[PDB]
Write a protein that binds this ligand. Structure first.
Ligand code: ACO
Ligand code: ACO
Ligand code: MG
Ligand code: MG
Ligand code: MG
Lengths: 722, 429, 719
């Protein structure tokens, strides 16, 4: 029948899609049939997400093969996102931290607990995608008005929405994951990261709680299912938080069981904790009534009480409560007692893995056993131990009051989780607090041993104090490239945008109160220097394309020099190039040497864009406002261009551009000594003092500068020829 | 005392009087007045619609409770329906997540009630109702001002106060989720909220419902109260239990739930999980590639072997062979065929395992050898306390771990007794 | 009856509210009764907006009385808004430009045409208000954990939502205005600005005004909604009449004096000529230009216009243009040239002027007439002119194709509109493109002549090139204060936040590509130096208060030196203060925001005993030099005790300085550096008298003085 044919046709198409190389080494726990029966008969097309996902995946695979990587941050505004693509960053990260911090019209801002509605991050992403698509439309409109020569000159920015967005823990079970993924896809997002935390306890700070691996895998599988239904080859990033986690909310998964901690004649950690809290309450700290949450039996309170007295913990409580009375909030005092209690309980309980426990008995080889225990279920490890050494071990004893089991968190556990998830994820990510290449290497090597083609991702916390690492500035510069080499293809400063937004606001708000409208002038100057699009806001937001739309809608019936231009020096260099018969049209560039620096670089560029000469300098003012040009470096790279007064022309421009009274050269070379001395003879400088190898100080000859700058260019013509 | 210290002490005192008022008689808070005032800042806010509605609505329900009378209502599906029911003289409104799921929104496809909508969804729905009620009141009042005193006495005036109890599901996660959900309800003027003791990820309207421990439920209710206290709204907290129909719980850590845990008494049986996965793997190995569910887990060979042994003895591998042959002779979707086998397999496993509570288990030992005295002790006893009492004078073979589902959920004896146990634990909150 | 009493009680309360000094000189076109009728019986309370509006209004009145002002900008994020208040700016602006530029989940970003849904700016404002209220809660939580002495030391920021938000043109008529105002009030916004543009054509760049009666109705509608909600909201009336050339009606007598008309009435209508020109293009084969098909203009009109177009040589230009088009093979540029030339020709021949200027030309008392014409209806001016023996004048001739009348835009028209609006608005604002004190003065003086108590507001366009004004840097610094003096109490850089957001993103993105993770290190360093709250993000977003909430919810059952510290110098100054029998604090901040130039200050208990103004500079190999532009030991009795020598020792250690350069030294500087050479701090000292001192650091002697035993150091202090 036509009905049966249409179905079989789509099942076949879907099967080819499944079997394509895009999904090599990916396991789906469902069939093409199961996907097609969800799609109905009315066509839909999520083309933005579909095409972005394709291109973005191919690009990441290209960089993984070249041992290269994208280094990015989370933009805090659509402007930031459009800007980073202008500056040539290839992809964007979008995180839940920044989303929490921003809030919304109905959401108060706050810490990242994924307590916002699951629509929150998609809604944020939607703003970014609309900004990128609008930027593309505005750019394209302008490029159509341009000629072929202008199009070859004026650069075209890539505004494709290569975004990997935060899907938290999935905000519940599989219907929540599918809904979250659907909302991302609908607004054009091609990548999503899901972590193995328990939704209710999700955090970024100590007591992280993991879920079993089967739960995490189901989240990833659910996501893939939704992506398949929507015909979008979305990039699924599996994050593990197992590196720092100490708790798990279930012990049902065999892969987690090797990492479980167990205790014995000791009473349960829960019993002891609650009994200790009850003692604080009975001694008159009414604030600590947490024991009312539980219905713990008398026998349990008795046993725990016994242990608490023997170990001297009830002693510590009595002392603590007396310290409290003599002095108010008991936050600090209780903390001290708890830590001491925990230390005591761990110590007495003999808290270790079932591996470590059977290893102690053996006093099968020792190292041979470890290998078996590390890949063995609890039931399988007990069966093998009894067959050989069945020690006392209970993980139930060590449960928290909530009922969470304790586990051995660390990179080995992160590896175990990530390896389990690898067949269901396109990218693996181990959450790190500290930036450390060795930790990253341990992870990457372990993964690649079993999955050589598995792409990885690395997070760079903005709060990690980089100056405590002991790394050199050069090691910091190279850190992203080092990640790339180990197969971390996508590395991101999570809420970078939030940080720079804050600093910018502090600065401008302070500047406005300090210097009034001069604060705006200085910002405008900065924008003119780097030739920012923000120079012309009306154009930036797409005024030209909008004007065109108004014309179409109505059938066309609707109704001083601020800085010395670089062009001036370019004209002088034309005279110069003419006299010495160079075929080379010389261009002048004046930008900060590095982004945001007061230190500028003036560069002279040929037709090939090879740098023929440069000056690295910064203007500085004295207390009365006089300006000095501090020169730290200068070069005439062409040996054939030297001793023709090229640098004398550049200096004349700089002195005019910056209204300089003097020029200081720090750590001069010999060439510098010879140059400044002869520039004294041409009359550019009145006086020149030189401490060989340390500093040159050259006072500007204002009359001679004024003479050379006369628009007739007579004196300037003589200087160039003689 | 500084003005800063005074302002604080003043609000702590006001808050303490509020706590101690008869409104909260028999209510336990796991926090102090100080902890509430710390959250409020210095810039006044006032959720007056919710505050005043909550007051009047609570008093009214108390009046009806004392008179042994009640409100009978339904969930309106539109603001018009809500305004209409108040015209017809129904005193209060219900608003549920089922209808919200079924309606969808501009960004939410309609569907079953799995609480998979954003936690803003039901509050947003409630907001429409409250605006409709307040607007109706304004329209009525405007007309009544144009009327004479005689016409006013003739023409009846309807009560459009927003007496609403709205669905807060499971709380959509932990305590920050509950507080956010409650905040959103209060902000749009809703004075009542119901929270159920289901696991958020598996929430359903009934088959296979999964409960949470009572400590988790109590924390949800306490979290809600905390948020309501911060906002100075004496909101009505409804604790729902789904324990009457539920068969599963996601933890065995709470002493109040432990009496209802189901365990195997015949401990030579392999785990339900092992047997289920082994059965699925057989289908796969016999050429049904569709059924690859076993690839979700990393079950050991020893476990697959033991389970395999049991599956053959009980004739289940037999049923699989027959099923796969029926499949080949027809190779269409195997949904129906697999279902029959699994149903037959579940029955077999439940029957051979001897599934009962640790209560029922020790009761059998004593009925072979006081009996009714023990039941009373077992029904209020932790698992550790019940084992200690049984060993003292009949410690039979019993394992609840054997009976866990593949997800790792424990089986429990659902029914009205379990509903009672949960509800009694929740009552002070 | 109780029903009648309750009503009369609220009417009386509402009447007292109306009559309060808050609304002195404000006209309402409605009664207290009309307000109470709207309120129903179920109480509501918009307390955030109500209390903010009260405090914000009183504050602006203080500032007006003192001839001072608030100078602010539009924050582009909730972080920016919280930050501005930290830095001590008292109030916030929120504009539709930035809202348009940002877009939303359903709104593509774009130019400011007020084409977003009227919910857009309120939704944006809501984010800001929630950020401010949350900041207050987080601050207050921390201050409760502090002791009374810690509270007296740590400053408390004012996070009250003093916001004036953009309500555009009102997004339609009175039900639209009331809805827009309601949405602002509901999210806690206490101030709103409404402009006198036509909604459909709203712009920031051919502006079209509405009659004054329409604008006044918008303002009255707003007041009505605010009164219903019991919020004394601040209504800002904006006029765009300074730059506008068009108005969509000639019905209001106040606008009629500014109407432009043709004096040469043998010319055909501007509309006729424009359409006829377009039709010619079409008929000559440019199918693209079919704009004339929008209208049903008669043959007689096309003929008359055609006649004029031929005589003036415009049809000539069209023929040439179409030939240029064919030879090349889009006609956007070509048509534009012809149109501009056509417009020039039509304006020239039509003799476009006001009916005032027209009757003034005939009389050749002159200056007496101007005064009458400027305050006269069109009908009243004609009656007075005929009586005085009535030139040819038609404004209909000059209408655009849409049917908009031309008007004489400028400051006089802005004044006329603003004076009409003054009794209905709390603040008046004349939209300006250029920043010019004289233009502002002309406006302010004209307003204050009739309304001495009328508060004003002034916009500072971020796109206005400040360096083209010819103002000095010092004049730019003083411009806000000068506005304040003329009674402009609230002055704002509209989309400042949008601009700084962009610059910050460009810089960091460039820096990350240039310098990898060193880009983050440098940002972190900057934050540590100024002690920014962004240093500790978890605290900034309210982690402590949130942790407390988790504890409450669960009943407490839930489970290396980067820089040489300022403290080191403070300890040295304790030794120093001890020996000379005098508690000195050290401060090291940028001299101005974002500057590489730092100021080290020494502060007493009463707070500046000494300072050094300097900047570190590196040579090309990385060696650091301290460049000192100023230094002071302000107390004459504290001099020549080696206070400055201690500060230098710290700075040299803190910055790992190889040398110290002093630019434009004084005599005291010469004496100081020379003696510091003798103590061995410097090996070599070169001095060009009055220009520069260069002093090379003696590394051995520095190392000796920095030994933790403080033996050498103690000897240095005591002499
Ligand atoms: C603080 C610092 O900048 S230190 C870093 C300095 N950089 C270097 O040493 C890099 C290597 N050197 C160079 O690239 C170049 O030689 C530079 C940049 C120093 C000078 O560039 P040039 O284009 O040669 O300088 P320019 O020609 O303008 O010099 C002006 C006058 O000095 C003279 N001059 C320049 N170099 C020399 C030399 N080595 N010997 C004699 N005279 C010289 C020129 O001939 C000219 O005078 P004249 O035409 O009247 O004879
Ligand atoms: C930095 C610039 O480019 S602008 C110039 C700086 N500012 C000024 O001139 C403003 C006024 N001057 C001053 O405030 C002070 O004189 C300063 C800042 C220059 C010096 O401050 P002091 O705290 O006196 O410097 P300090 O005590 O460290 O001086 C170090 C040595 O120089 C000597 N010295 C400093 N000033 C004098 C002086 N006027 N006469 C003689 N000796 C002096 C000191 O006596 C000391 O040597 P000694 O104690 O062993 O005899
Ligand atoms: Mg993989
Ligand atoms: Mg109760
Ligand atoms: Mg007024």
């Amino acid at each position: 029948t036509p009905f049966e044919q249409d179905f079989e046709k789509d099942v076949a198409a879907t099967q080819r899609y499944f079997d394509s190389s895009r999904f090599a080494g990916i396991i789906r726990l469902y069939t093409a049939r199961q996907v097609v029966e969800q799609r109905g008969t009315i066509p839909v097309d999520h083309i933005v997400a579909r095409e972005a996902a394709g291109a973005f995946y191919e690009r990441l695979r290209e960089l993984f093969a070249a041992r290269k990587s994208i280094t990015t941050f989370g933009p805090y505004s659509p402007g930031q996102a459009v800007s980073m693509k202008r500056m040539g960053i290839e992809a964007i990260y979008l995180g839940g931290w920044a989303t929490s911090a921003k809030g919304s019209s109905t959401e108060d801002p706050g810490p990242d607990l994924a307590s916002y509605p699951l629509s929150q991050v998609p809604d944020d992403a939607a703003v970014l995608v609309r900004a990128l698509l609008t930027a593309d439309r505005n750019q394209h409109y302008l490029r159509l008005q341009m000629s072929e020569r202008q199009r070859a000159a004026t650069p075209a920015y890539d505004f494709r929405p290569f975004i990997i967005a935060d899907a938290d823990t999935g905000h519940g079970g599989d219907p929540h994951v599918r809904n979250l993924i659907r909302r991302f896809v609908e607004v054009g997002v091609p990548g999503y990261h899901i972590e193995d935390q328990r939704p209710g306890t999700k955090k970024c700070g100590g007591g992280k709680v993991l879920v079993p691996s089967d739960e995490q895998i189901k989240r990833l599988n659910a996501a893939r299912f939704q992506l398949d239904i929507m015909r979008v080859p979305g990039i699924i990033v599996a994050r593990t938080d197992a590196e720092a986690a100490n708790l798990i909310d279930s012990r049902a998964d065999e892969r987690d069981q090797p990492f479980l901690l167990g205790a014995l004649d000791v009473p349960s950690y829960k019993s002891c904790f609650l009994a200790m809290v009850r003692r604080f309450y009975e001694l008159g700290v009414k604030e600590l009534n947490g024991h009312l949450l539980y219905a713990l039996g008398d026998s349990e309170y008795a046993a725990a009480g016994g242990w608490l007295e023997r170990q001297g913990i009830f002693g510590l409580v009595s002392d603590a409560v007396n310290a409290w009375r003599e002095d108010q909030s008991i936050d600090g005092i209780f903390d001290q007692v708890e830590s001491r209690f925990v230390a005591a309980w761990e110590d007495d309980a003999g808290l270790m893995t079932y591996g470590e426990a059977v290893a102690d008995v053996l006093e099968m080889a020792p190292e041979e056993w470890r290998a078996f225990a590390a890949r063995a279920s609890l039931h399988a490890a007990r069966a093998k131990a009894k067959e050989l050494a069945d020690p006392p071990w209970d993980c139930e004893l060590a449960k928290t009051p909530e009922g969470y089991y304790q586990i051995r968190g660390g990179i080995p556990y992160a590896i175990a989780k990530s390896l389990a998830a690898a067949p269901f994820a396109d990218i693996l990510w181990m959450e790190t607090k500290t930036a450390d290449l060795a930790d990253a290497r341990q992870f990457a090597e372990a993964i690649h041993a079993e999955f050589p083609d598995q792409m990885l991702a690395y997070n760079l916390s903005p709060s990690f104090n980089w100056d405590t690492t002991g790394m050199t500035d050069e090691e910091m510069r190279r850190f992203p490239e080092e990640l790339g080499k180990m197969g971390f293809v996508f590395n991101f400063i999570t809420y970078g945008g939030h940080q720079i937004d804050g600093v910018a606001a502090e600065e401008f708000a302070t500047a406005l109160r300090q210097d009034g409208m001069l604060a705006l002038a200085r910002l405008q100057r900065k924008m003119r220097l780097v030739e920012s699009p923000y120079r012309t806001p009306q154009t930036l937001v797409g005024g030209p394309r909008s004007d065109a739309a108004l014309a179409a809608s109505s059938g066309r019936t609707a109704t001083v020099q601020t800085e010395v231009p670089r062009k001036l020096l370019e004209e002088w260099l034309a005279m110069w190039s003419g006299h010495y018969q160079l075929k080379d049209k010389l261009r002048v560039q004046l930008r900060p040497q590095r982004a945001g620096s007061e230190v500028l670089e003036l560069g002279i560029h040929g037709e090939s864009d090879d740098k023929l000469a440069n000056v690295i300098f910064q203007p500085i003012q004295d207390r009365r406002g006089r300006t000095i040009l501090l020169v730290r470096d200068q070069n005439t790279f062409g040996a054939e261009l030297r001793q023709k007064r090229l640098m004398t022309l550049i200096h004349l421009w700089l002195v005019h551009r910056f209204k300089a009274q003097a020029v200081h050269y720090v750590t001069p070379t010999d060439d510098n000594l010879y140059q400044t001395s002869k520039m004294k003879s041409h009359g550019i400088f009145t006086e020149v003092n030189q401490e060989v190898g340390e500093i040159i100080v050259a006072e500007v000859n204002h009359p001679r500068i004024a003479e050379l700058l006369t628009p007739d260019r007579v004196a300037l013509r003589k200087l160039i020829t003689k | 005392h500084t003005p800063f210290e005074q302002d604080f002490e003043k609000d702590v005192a006001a808050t303490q009087r509020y706590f101690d008022s008869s409104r909260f008689a028999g209510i336990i808070r796991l926090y102090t007045a100080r902890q509430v005032v710390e959250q409020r800042g210095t810039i006044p806010v006032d959720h007056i619609v919710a505050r005043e509605a909550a007051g009047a609505f609570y008093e009214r329900l108390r009046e009806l409770f004392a008179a042994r009378k009640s409100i009978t209502t339904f969930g309106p599906y539109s603001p018009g329906q809500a305004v209409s029911m108040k015209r017809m003289g129904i005193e209060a409104i219900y608003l549920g997540g089922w209808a919200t799921s079924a309606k969808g929104s501009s960004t939410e496809d309609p569907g079953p009630d799995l609480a998979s909508y954003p936690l803003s969804q039901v509050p947003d729905d409630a907001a429409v109702l409250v605006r409709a009620l307040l607007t109706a009141d304004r329209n009525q009042h405007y007309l009544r001002l144009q009327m004479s005193e005689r016409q006013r006495a003739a023409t009846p005036a309807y009560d459009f106060r927003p007496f609403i109890i709205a669905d807060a599901d499971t709380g959509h996660g932990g305590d920050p989720h509950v507080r956010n959900l409650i905040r959103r309800f209060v902000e749009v003027g809703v004075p009542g909220y119901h929270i159920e003791d289901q696991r958020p990820g598996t929430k359903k309207c009934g088959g296979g419902k999964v409960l949470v421990p009572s400590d988790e439920q109590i924390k949800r209710l306490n979290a809600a109260r905390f948020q309501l206290d911060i906002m100075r709204v004496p909101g009505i907290i409804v604790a729902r239990t789904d324990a009457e129909a539920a068969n599963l719980i996601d933890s065995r850590a709470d002493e109040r739930d432990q009496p209802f845990l189901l365990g195997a008494t015949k401990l030579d049986v392999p785990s339900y999980k092992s047997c289920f996965l082994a059965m699925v793997r057989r289908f796969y190995e016999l050429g049904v590639k569709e059924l690859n569910g076993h690839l979700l887990y990393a079950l050991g060979d020893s476990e697959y072997a033991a389970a395999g042994g049991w599956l053959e003895r009980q004739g289940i591998f037999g049923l699989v062979s027959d099923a796969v042959n029926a499949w080949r002779e027809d190779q269409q979707s195997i949904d129906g065929i697999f279902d029959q086998v699994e149903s037959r397999f579940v029955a077999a496993w439940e029957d051979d395992a001897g599934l009962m509570t640790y209560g029922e288990a020790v009761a059998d030992v004593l009925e072979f050898g006081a009996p009714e005295e023990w039941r009373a002790f077992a029904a209020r006893a932790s698992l550790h306390a019940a084992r200690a009492k049984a060993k003292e004078l009949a410690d039979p073979p019993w394992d609840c771990e054997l009976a866990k589902t593949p997800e790792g959920y424990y089986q429990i004896r659902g029914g009205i007794p379990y509903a009672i146990a949960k509800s009694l634990a929740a009552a002070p909150f």
